[PDB]
């Protein structure tokens, strides 16, 4: 039964039902369906006068479920297809899909863009040598409580056509992946699918990913990356396909993410699971008064009911679309468009990848220890999939460079922003506070020739301590970064 309509303090009751002739093989497990049928009674082989009830199905209807068992088949009607083509021809459908995700959540615009990229997904490719590459992206929202990450998980589970919502504490290794159970009558083992089998071709959402057990986290690695679960248990060996896009939410190991604390201490995840994730969105609370007053007004408008009026008016405005239309558009974009890349896009993509790897050199130089947030070749495949999803928004078969720079912007906003989180410093600060006075400026070439060519300090100490004085806001930069000015 529907979880929204369960009675108080009880369990949802499973009821056995039957289909005949062309009503068979119409529903995937996990969908929400309305069924019309007769409520008949049949005698079962298992007290007094107990005859078990069932429902003989006369009719199946489901807007969330489409095309029965999936055959990549176009069953959308012609005027709805023309309306969907009109939506794909819209010049600002990207902002429409961004505003469609979480209308009652202020901020988190890059998270909403990554969610839309997760819902559209990449393109699955097949090579002649059997090389299968991933066509889905996995996004991990790591951050402080009160950032509405779990509400984003719930809204992703609502919008997506195939989606399941799971826990970290309520999970298990045989629960997320497929389990091996025993049939009672035959006494033979059989595989019953888990949460990543019910989400095949769709979205799995994990809440409190930081807390799920260490033996429980690592049964997911082939199901995230290889898109398959290889099970050899109880005399049954098989490789089931699980094409699941993973959306996980987590807090750091410490209670809140601390900017004073090192990023290695906040994350006790292995580097493998962050290599598998594609958007590692680390979110914080900066306590800005404008942001606090804006979120205060927004949540007040949500609680009073005025946000119902604003979203109902803005739907008729045409800048937002509902759950059903966006769900069917996700299904149509996955079933119609699977784009390739232009040759000029590959130069920009490879150049940005070697640029961010060269930046990872600079990130891992001075700390001398390995970063907990790695950028590997799988992250280049991630940016490829982001570009292909950005092409899949507007049914574009060619992923041009305009989509490429937005993909680069999303990756810099998520993963490069996440990865960027003794006597020399104090001696530089004293020498520079005595060297240039309050209200006067110095060129960077003067500091280079007098503090590096003199070998008073290193160049890395200069580059770090200029930023250190910048964030202290007593000495800032002016005139295109070529002047250092003491604000005083």
């Amino acid at each position: 039964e529907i979880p929204e309509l369960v009675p108080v303090g009880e369990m949802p009751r499973n009821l056995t039902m039957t289909c005949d002739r062309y009503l068979t093989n119409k529903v995937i497990p996990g969908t929400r369906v309305t069924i019309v049928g007769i409520y008949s009674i049949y005698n079962s082989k298992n007290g007094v006068a107990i005859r078990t009830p069932y429902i003989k199905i006369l009719g199946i209807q489901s807007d969330v479920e489409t095309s029965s068992i999936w055959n990549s088949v176009t069953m959308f009607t012609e005027e709805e297809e023309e309306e969907f083509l009109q939506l794909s021809r819209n010049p600002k459908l990207y902002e429409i899909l961004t505003n469609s995700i979480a209308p009652s959540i202020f901020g988190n615009e890059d998270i909403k863009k990554a969610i839309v990229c997760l819902l559209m997904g990449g393109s699955k490719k097949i090579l002649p040598d059997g090389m299968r590459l991933r066509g889905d992206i996995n996004v991990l929202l790591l951050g402080d409580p009160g950032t509405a990450k779990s509400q984003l998980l719930k809204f992703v589970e609502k919008v997506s056509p195939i989606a399941v919502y799971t826990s970290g504490k309520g999970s298990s290794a045989a629960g997320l992946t497929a389990s091996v159970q025993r049939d009672p009558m035959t006494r033979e083992f059989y595989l019953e699918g888990g949460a990543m089998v019910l989400a095949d071709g769709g979205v799995v959402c994990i809440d409190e990913f930081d807390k799920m057990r260490d033996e429980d986290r690592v049964a997911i690695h082939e199901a995230m990356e290889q898109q398959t679960i290889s099970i050899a248990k109880a005399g049954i060996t098989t490789v089931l396909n699980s094409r699941t896009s993973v959306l996980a939410a987590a807090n750091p190991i410490y209670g809140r993410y601390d900017d004073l604390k090192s990023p290695g201490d906040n994350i006790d995840f292995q580097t493998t699971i962050l290599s598998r994730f594609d958007m590692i969105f680390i979110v914080k609370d900066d306590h800005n008064e404008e942001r606090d007053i804006s979120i205060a007004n927004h949540v007040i408008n949500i609680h009073t009911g005025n946000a119902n009026a604003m979203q109902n008016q803005q739907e008729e405005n045409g800048s937002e679309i509902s759950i059903e239309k966006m769900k069917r558009y996700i299904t149509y974009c996955r079933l119609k468009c699977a784009p390739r890349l232009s040759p000029q896009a590959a130069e920009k993509l490879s150049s940005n990848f070697v640029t961010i790897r060269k930046q990872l050199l600079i990130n891992e130089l001075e700390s001398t220890e390995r970063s907990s947030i790695p950028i590997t070749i799988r992250q280049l495949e991630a940016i490829i999939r982001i570009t292909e999803s950005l092409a899949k928004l507007e049914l574009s078969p060619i992923a041009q460079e305009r989509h490429v720079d937005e993909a680069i912007r999303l990756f810099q906003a998520s993963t490069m922003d996440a990865a960027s989180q003794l006597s020399e410093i104090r001696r530089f600060e004293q020498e520079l506070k005595r060297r240039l006075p309050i209200g006067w400026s110095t060129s960077y070439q003067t500091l280079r020739r007098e503090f590096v060519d003199t070998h008073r300090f290193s160049q890395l100490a200069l580059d770090k301590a200029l930023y250190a004085l910048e964030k202290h806001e007593t000495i800032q930069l002016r005139h295109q970064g070529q002047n250092i000015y003491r604000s005083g």
């Binding site: 990549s72 393109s123 699955k124 490719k125 090579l127 040598d129 059997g130 090389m131 299968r132 590459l133 290794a173 992946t177 035959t186 006494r187 033979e188 083992f189 033996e215 690592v218 049964a219 690695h221 082939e222 990356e225 290889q226 290889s230 099970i231 050899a232 248990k233 109880a234 005399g235 049954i236 060996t237 490789v239 292995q270 493998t272 290599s275 119609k336 468009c337 699977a338 784009p339 390739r340 890349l341 040759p343 590959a346 993509l349 490879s350 990848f353 070697v354 790897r357 990872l360 390995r370 907990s372 790695p374 590997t376 070749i377 280049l380 495949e381 490829i384 574009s396 078969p397 060619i398």
Partner: protein, 253 residues
């Protein structure tokens, strides 16, 4: 009727002429090495070992009964996204008989053999697990660093004995498993250390390390020129279009 659907492919005489023509070349090892998985860049010696793994060496059975193993086994430990699991998938596809397994998706009884009843007989019998059904073939183990110890016992038993002894349910049977093993693993840390520590290579005991003939270790060292070469290679990989299919449609030297 029953058709095999060609695991042992028939060999026409034109194929034999091609095989004996290419065998006379001096770099047939290189040609057949880079012919394995052109989409995978690097790991050239690893693909050479994969080639020598598919055509494993001769086995010699002595007069006193010592079983000398001719099946070379390879353990690949190293950094994430060094395409070890992709080489596992490639040797899964291109072998005559290949069986895959995973660290958290395997049981020790489920790898060798399990005793169950039979429906038409009403009699107990064995069904072979993953590691026995791949006889005269290859086993593609992924995430080998995180077996349960029960599965480690059975795997180590096959690597030291090549036969499994089942003594349960009134059944005393021995089963032959003359099979090769290729396995992929991560270090005990998140990333592999360049401190060359012997203990932090793998989390498995060194006794299981000893039965593996080739312990390949891979480091994803961060570079500029070779990194650009790998980047352009994987963007050439993504730009492939399968023949006979429309541009921009879902897929159905």
């Amino acid at each position: 009727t029953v058709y095999p659907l060609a695991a042992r492919q028939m060999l026409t005489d034109f194929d034999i002429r091609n095989i004996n023509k290419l065998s006379k070349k001096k770099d047939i090892f290189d040609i057949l090495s880079q012919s394995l998985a052109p989409s995978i860049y690097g790991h050239d010696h690893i693909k050479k070992a994969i080639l020598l793994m598919l055509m494993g060496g001769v086995e010699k059975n002595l007069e006193n009964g010592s079983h000398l193993r001719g099946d070379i086994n390879i353990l690949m430990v190293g950094d994430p996204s060094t395409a070890k699991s992709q080489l596992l998938r490639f040797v899964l596809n291109t072998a005559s008989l290949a069986i895959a397994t995973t660290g958290r998706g395997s049981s020790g009884v489920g790898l060798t053999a399990a005793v169950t009843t039979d429906r038409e007989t009403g009699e107990r019998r064995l069904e072979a697990g993953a590691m026995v059904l791949a006889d005269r073939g290859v086993v593609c183990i992924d995430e080998f660093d995180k077996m349960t110890d029960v599965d480690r016992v059975a795997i180590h038993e096959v690597m030291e004995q090549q036969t499994v002894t089942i003594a349960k349910a009134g059944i005393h049977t021995t089963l032959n498993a003359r099979c090769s093993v290729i396995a992929a693993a991560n270090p005990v840390f998140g990333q592999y250390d360049v401190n060359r520590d012997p203990h932090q290579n793998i989390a498995l005991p060194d006794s299981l390390l000893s039965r593996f003939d080739l312990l390949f270790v891979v480091t994803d060292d961060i570079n500029e020129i070779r990194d650009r070469s790998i980047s352009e290679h994987v963007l050439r990989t993504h730009r492939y279009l399968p023949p006979g299919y429309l541009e921009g449609e879902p897929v159905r030297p």
